[PDB]
Amino acid sequence: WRYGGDPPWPRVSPACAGRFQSPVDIRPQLAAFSPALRPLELLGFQLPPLPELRLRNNGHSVQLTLPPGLEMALGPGREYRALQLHLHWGAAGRPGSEHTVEGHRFPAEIHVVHLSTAFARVDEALGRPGGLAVLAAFLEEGPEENSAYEQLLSRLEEIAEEGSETQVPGLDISALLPSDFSRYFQYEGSLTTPPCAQGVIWTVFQQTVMLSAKQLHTLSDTLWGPGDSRLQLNFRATQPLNGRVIEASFP
Amino acid sequence: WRYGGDPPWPRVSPACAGRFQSPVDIRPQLAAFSPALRPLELLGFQLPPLPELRLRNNGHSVQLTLPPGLEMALGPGREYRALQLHLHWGAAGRPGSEHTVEGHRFPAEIHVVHLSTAFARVDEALGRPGGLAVLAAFLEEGPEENSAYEQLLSRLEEIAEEGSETQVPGLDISALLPSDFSRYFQYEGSLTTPPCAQGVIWTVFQQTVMLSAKQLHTLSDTLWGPGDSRLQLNFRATQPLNGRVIEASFP
Ligand SMILES: COC(=O)c1cc(S(N)(=O)=O)c(SC2CCCCC2)cc1Cl
Ligand SMILES: COC(=O)c1cc(S(N)(=O)=O)c(SC2CCCCC2)cc1Cl
Ligand SMILES: [Zn+2]
Ligand SMILES: [Zn+2]
Numbered sequence: 494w495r496y497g498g499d500p501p502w503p504r505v506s507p508a509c510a511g512r513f514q515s516p517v518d519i520r521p522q523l524a525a526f527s528p529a530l531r532p533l534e535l536l537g538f539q540l541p542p543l544p545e546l547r548l549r550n551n552g553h554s555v556q557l558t559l560p561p562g563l564e565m566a567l568g569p570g571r572e573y574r575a576l577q578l579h580l581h582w583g584a585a586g587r588p589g590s591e592h593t594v595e596g597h598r599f600p601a602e603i604h605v606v607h608l609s610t611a612f613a614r615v616d617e618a619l620g621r622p623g624g625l626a627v628l629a630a631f632l633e634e635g636p637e638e639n640s641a642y643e644q645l646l647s648r649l650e651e652i653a654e655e656g657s658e659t660q661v662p663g664l665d666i667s668a669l670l671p672s673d674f675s676r677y678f679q680y681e682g683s684l685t686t687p688p689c690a691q692g693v694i695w696t697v698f699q700q701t702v703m704l705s706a707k708q709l710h711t712l713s714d715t716l717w718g719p720g721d722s723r724l725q726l727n728f729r730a731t732q733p734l735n736g737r738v739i740e741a742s743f744p
Numbered sequence: 745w746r747y748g749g750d751p752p753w754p755r756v757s758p759a760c761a762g763r764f765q766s767p768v769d770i771r772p773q774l775a776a777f778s779p780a781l782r783p784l785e786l787l788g789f790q791l792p793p794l795p796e797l798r799l800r801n802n803g804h805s806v807q808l809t810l811p812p813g814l815e816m817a818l819g820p821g822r823e824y825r826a827l828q829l830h831l832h833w834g835a836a837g838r839p840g841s842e843h844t845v846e847g848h849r850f851p852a853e854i855h856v857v858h859l860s861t862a863f864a865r866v867d868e869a870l871g872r873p874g875g876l877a878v879l880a881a882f883l884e885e886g887p888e889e890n891s892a893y894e895q896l897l898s899r900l901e902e903i904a905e906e907g908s909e910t911q912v913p914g915l916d917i918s919a920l921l922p923s924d925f926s927r928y929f930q931y932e933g934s935l936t937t938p939p940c941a942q943g944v945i946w947t948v949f950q951q952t953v954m955l956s957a958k959q960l961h962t963l964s965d966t967l968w969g970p971g972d973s974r975l976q977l978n979f980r981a982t983q984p985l986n987g988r989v990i991e992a993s994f995p
Contacts, residue, residue, distance in 0.1 A: 621875075738780040738782075
């Protein structure tokens with residue numbers, strides 16, 4: 494499968510034609526305040542430099558494979574383990590976040606994909622309720638260089654080639670996310686890539702993460718994709734809520 | 745395992761010492777109002793008189809096998825098929841509901857047990873989040889004979905003996921349930937019988953169903969359990985929430 498160009502995605506996976514797909518346009522006015530939604534809890538995210546992690550240009554994103562041991566709770570009894578993180582970005586003067594807020598697209602978005610601790614394998618969790626959970630944060634232009642992000646953005650040149658990978662030192666994975674783990678939107682949707690399986694819990698942080706203009710440019714301008722062509726605008730079109738209600742952890 | 749003795753239930757099934765067990769004490773003023781909680785949808789529950797349904801004294805409860813085609817939705821895309829229903833009750837002048845409200849135990853309780861349609865088999869769904877969903881209603885004493893419950897209660901005498909069973913005409917299963925499908929409590933817990941699997945979504949109707957005194961006496965007084973003892977007080981003690989917030993569909 495390619496971005497914005499054949500193949501139909503439903504030719505690749507019927508699930509890409511489901512009624513309850515991601516990403517979505519978040520309208521904070523229409524979100525349901527749900528006080529049951531407690532602050533997210535992360536254990537094991539502060540990684541030592543060794544062992545190193547695989548950072549890959551899979552020709553769709555830059556993917557960082559996460560080691561065993563990264564535990565994430567959405568709340569009492571809702572336990573997950575981190576598998577990987579990847580990013581969605583645009584191009585020079587074109588934003589590329591997947592989620593939008595009242596129609597506004599942010600420059601980029603980080604996703605940390607997690608597997609429910611009721612499942613041994615991703616293939617058993619796909620399409621099952623709460624089988625996968627994604628933590629998503631918007632990236633916005635800031636005045637300072639983000640030094641958490643610099644550790645990965647500095648390695649992109651090594652993996653410019655489509656299908657290329659490198660080993661990078663472990664780092665504080667939680668430092669790539671906002672500091673506010675209490676304020677977020679939550680909804681049930683899908684993977685935004687084939688196979689677009691449903692039953693995914695999306696948590697979208699209200700607080701954004703700041704990258705320098707230079708970092709956003711390194712993200713959007715270094716990697717190559719399928720087809721002597723730049724890896725850019727790697728986001729799926731907004732999908733209708735189709736009657737789903739987005740919950741907010743805050744009034 | 746019998747009810748009200750040994751073997752301690754952990755010594756039958758370590759799962760019963762899980763951290764997120766059922767039933768629980770509902771305290772409506774600590775419940776979180778969650779406007780995302782939509783009215784329950786129950787299609788296919790109005791059964792014709794044939795085929796007949798298996799009704800069973802299994803020594804723990806009376807259990808009605810439900811046919812295929814009873815479809816239930818907790819939310820958009822979040823669908824279930826009914827498997828069976830059974831009851832929990834007390835004895836002469838003693839209540840036997842499983843769930844309590846502010847400490848109050850009701851005369852009896854009906855459980856309608858469903859399988860998520862993301863799972864082909866019950867055994868795949870046990871322990872998976874949202875794999876099983878139970879609809880629970882409290883049975884309270886009313887002036888009138890409940891004609892929906894009379895179809896089952898009139899048949900208890902035929903199956904009075906542990907392990908005996910009978911065939912009963914199709915009935916409207918939805919007629920055993922309260923009037924307002926928009927008003928309920930919901931939390932995630934467990935089976936209240938071994939193997940005490942967690943990941944069960946419990947939906948407890950705010951409104952109660954009314955049975956006559958005669959009918960409740962028939963329920964608690966007709967059936968024989970393990971050994972030569974009466975099948976009575978077939979409810980599990982209430983369990984700690986351990987941080988779980990009970991949600992409410994109504995303010
Ligand atoms: C540009 O989009 C992506 O490259 C991408 C985006 C996602 S997402 N946005 O989280 O759905 C996943 S997640 C999924 C892929 C299939 C197997 C489990 C992990 C994997 C990937 Cl590879
Ligand atoms: C007195 O309790 C019961 O008789 C009972 C109570 C339940 S409950 N309250 O729904 O957990 C189930 S459900 C379950 C048991 C075996 C696995 C699938 C269905 C089955 C039964 Cl048989
Ligand atoms: Zn993604
Ligand atoms: Zn039960």
